[PDB]
């Protein structure tokens, strides 16, 4: 028997919505260690001989995400269900519901790791966005709130 | 003793160390003016009174300026980077001395520093240059 | 104690958030039912036996009163 705050997970986001979430999220990769290093050597070769705006990426640290929700800066928050200590993330759907930040439980922790240059991530969030994907993001917010939140209003109940 | 009996018996020898004279006559090491003016025949406290300098700052338990002037003798006797200087050249030639315009500027003053920061660095720039 | 331990809006938020998300412990699950049936008198008796001192049991039963009243109404 599962106490309602556990198994608020497993009632995860479905097939098509999850695919569309990654269609958005895979656009916003953090610049990998190799890519970042080569860019700075390009900067070294250029600026030593002879401007840029703030670049948007996903935010992916548990401490960073728990900061961003309640900041409030997070817009979408993805949460993996499979976590070795489950108690690490059990409060997080409740925190998002309380602060009114739209969240989604995604399926697979390594699935979050792929979009983020890590092995696993447990939580991923998209704070800010480029102007072109703004309408698409807000549409996905409504899509997730209709599919995830409104269908499973009774997820806080039932063992 | 068991082990000591062998060491006296063996043809290996003992690691003979004569280091009892050095435990008393310690050379001063940390000041050259003192290194010249320090009578080793005298003690620690007697050497301090001979110099002038205090050996103890508290009221001591029990009972009891040629050099100090030379210490007062030795008591009698930072730029900006290339990018920083060249960046300040860009600001000065653009605005002049309008620090309000200079910090509300976006293209040249990228890191949004205050009026006080920019003007201080310009004062240092105006010393090395015009 | 100049730095005694001021309210701190964040800490109050976290404590009350965890207070509901965790649920209720078995003695507290018994205790809240014991308030509604046997009154606040017998509730303080069981809480004093369960915990160490009575000074703990006062603030504990008082916390249960706040939880019950805020749940049913609002």
């Amino acid at each position: 028997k599962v106490p309602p705050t556990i198994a608020q997970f497993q009632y995860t986001l479905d097939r098509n919505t999850a695919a569309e979430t990654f269609k958005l999220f895979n656009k916003y990769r953090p610049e990998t260690a190799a890519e970042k290093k080569e860019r700075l050597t390009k900067e070294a070769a250029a600026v030593a001989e002879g401007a840029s705006p703030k670049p948007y990426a996903v935010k992916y640290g548990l401490n960073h995400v728990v900061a961003l929700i309640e900041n409030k800066k997070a817009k979408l928050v993805l949460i993996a269900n499979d976590v070795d200590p489950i108690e690490l993330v059990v409060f997080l759907p409740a925190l998002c519901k309380k602060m009114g930040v739209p969240y989604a439980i995604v399926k697979g922790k390594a699935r979050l790791g792929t979009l983020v240059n890590q092995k696993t991530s447990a939580v991923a969030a998209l704070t800010e966005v480029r102007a072109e994907d703004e309408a698409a993001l807000a549409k996905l917010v409504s899509t997730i709130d209709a599919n995830f939140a409104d269908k499973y209003d009774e997820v806080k109940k039932h063992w | 003793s068991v082990r000591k009996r062998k060491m006296n018996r063996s043809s290996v020898g003992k690691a003979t160390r004569r280091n009892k004279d050095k435990q008393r006559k310690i050379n001063i090491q940390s000041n050259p003016i003192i290194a010249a003016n320090w009578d080793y025949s005298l003690t620690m406290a007697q050497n301090y009174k001979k110099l002038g300098l205090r050996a103890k700052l508290q009221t001591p338990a029990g009972g009891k300026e040629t050099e100090v002037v030379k210490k007062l003798e030795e008591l009698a006797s930072r730029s900006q980077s290339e990018r920083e200087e060249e960046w300040l050249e860009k600001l000065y030639k653009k605005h002049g001395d309008d620090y309000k315009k200079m910090f509300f500027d976006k293209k040249l003053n990228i890191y949004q520093q205050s009026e006080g920061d920019l003007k201080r660095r310009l004062l240092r720039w105006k010393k090395r240059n015009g | 104690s100049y730095k005694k331990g001021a309210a701190s809006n964040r800490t109050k938020f976290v404590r009350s958030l965890v207070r509901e998300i965790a649920g209720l412990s078995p003695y507290e699950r018994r205790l809240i039912d014991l308030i509604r049936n046997s009154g606040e008198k017998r509730a303080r008796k069981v809480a004093k036996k369960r915990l160490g001192s009575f000074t703990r049991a006062k603030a504990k039963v008082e916390e249960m009163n706040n939880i019950i009243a805020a749940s049913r109404r609002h």
Binding site: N71, K98, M99, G100, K156, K157 | - | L17, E20, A70, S71
Partner: peptide, 26 residues
């Protein structure tokens, strides 16, 4: 029963100023 979270939050839980490091390029 999702009791406390039904009353949805308004100001963030802190009041910390956000530093100049989160504006001018890093």
């Amino acid at each position: 029963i999702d009791w406390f979270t039904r009353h949805e939050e308004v100001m963030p839980l802190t009041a910390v100023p956000e530093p100049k490091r989160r504006f001018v390029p890093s």
